[PDB]
Amino acid sequence: MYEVRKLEDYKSIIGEEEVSKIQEKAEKLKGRSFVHVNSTSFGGGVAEILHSLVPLLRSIGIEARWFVIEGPTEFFNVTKTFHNALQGNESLKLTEEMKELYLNVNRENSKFIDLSSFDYVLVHDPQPAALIEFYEKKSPWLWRCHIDLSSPNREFWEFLRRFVEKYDRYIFHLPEYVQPELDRNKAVIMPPSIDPLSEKNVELKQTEILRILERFDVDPEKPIITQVSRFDPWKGIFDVIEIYRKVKEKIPGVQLLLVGVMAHDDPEGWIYFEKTLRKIGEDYDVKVLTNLIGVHAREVNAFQRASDVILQMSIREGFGLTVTEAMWKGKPVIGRAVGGIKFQIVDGETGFLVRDANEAVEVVLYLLKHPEVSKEMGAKAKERVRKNFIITKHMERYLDILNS
């Protein structure tokens, strides 16, 4: 089990005042220990966030540290399974045999750094949940969940809760994710946040954007609508296409950017990707952008910045960070009222919430012809993210929680 961006760096974004409350709350906690544990050290989400959250924490005077459990492919393929199991997949089976490996690997990484010594402990997701077993609780232990436990594979959940039920707090992205069994009192809701200074969100130079745009045959002189999302059947990809076609009936130069990045191990994803290209046919005003052809965080960043309107027609959505990112870039978003999309968007305020494609077409048409209102909604949507979902307000939320 191995180990391992200041606050002032965001001053110009949040203003001294907000910077105060942070430094303020960070005092009645100064010096204490804030440990983080997880599986990977290289990646997005948890990894990417910690890489910034850790240093950022120290900056406010907090002995925060980050350790990473380690194990063989087996241990991960097992956890890979738990992941989906805990995500409703009833066809998965948990065998005592694999049930040991999990506990054993927890035992190996446990036999080392005395995680029980630190003032505060926080474990991210399943893989290291069992750690709270191999130590004697002295300090509070928090469990941060990133997946959805509203309806997990029972034989799997019942095994995990034996561990989770111990922690002093359970942190979920949103309500429709909390485990109903658990005590609504030791549970806390904390949405994932975007780092304004990350590659995906920092402001690129016009020149650089134009380069990326040309490199992918995207014309910035013609209108652009975009939906960045993983390729799967419940993301409204086919509806966005229909919206594009409809809208195109009146705005012939309108371009559609279907942006998405997915792991190699995502057969379904790539399958849906191919079905999309087949559905699109030879209409090349529709761009299908993915890491298959070089689209990464910097390019995703660009595609969003160059967008005039951004859509999110998810049927099944989690917190939806994509909407958050678009909002941060001053873009009006049009989506379906689900998961984090309904929470994040303030209808008619920051963007619009619709129930079908036709409503979506009306709004895109509206927004395309009324740029002032778009600029309007976008600036407000940006303030909503500034005041609600940036990595600093996220950190501030960890303070409160710890204070209590």
From Swiss-Prot:
Catalytic activity from the UniProt record: an NDP-alpha-D-glucose + D-glucose = alpha,alpha-trehalose + a ribonucleoside 5'-diphosphate + H(+)
Description of pH dependence: Optimum pH is 5.5. Stable from pH 5 to pH 8.
Documented EC number(s): 2.4.1.245
Pfam families in alphabetical order: Glycos_transf_1, TreT_GT1
Cofactor(s) required for function per UniProt: Mg(2+)
Top-rank taxon, per record: Archaea
GO molecular function terms listed in the Swiss-Prot or TrEMBL record: trehalose synthase activity
Entry-linked InterPro entries: Glyco_trans_1, Trehalose_Metab_GTase, Trehalose_synthase_GT, TreT_GT1
Keyword list, A-Z: Carbohydrate metabolism, Glucose metabolism, Glycosyltransferase, Magnesium, Transferase
Temperature dependence: Not thermostable. Approximately 25% of maximum activity remains after 1 hour incubation at 55 degrees Celsius.
One of the GO biological process terms: glucose metabolic process
Subunit details: Homodimer.
Family: Belongs to the glycosyltransferase group 1 family. Glycosyltransferase 4 subfamily.
PANTHER family per UniProt: SYNTHASE (CCG-9), PUTATIVE (AFU_ORTHOLOGUE AFUA_3G12100)-RELATED
Function description: Synthesizes trehalose from ADP-, UDP- or GDP-glucose and glucose.
Protein name: Trehalose synthase
Protein source organism: Pyrococcus horikoshii (strain ATCC 700860 / DSM 12428 / JCM 9974 / NBRC 100139 / OT-3)
Phylogenetic classification of the source organism: Archaea, Methanobacteriati, Methanobacteriota, Thermococci, Thermococcales
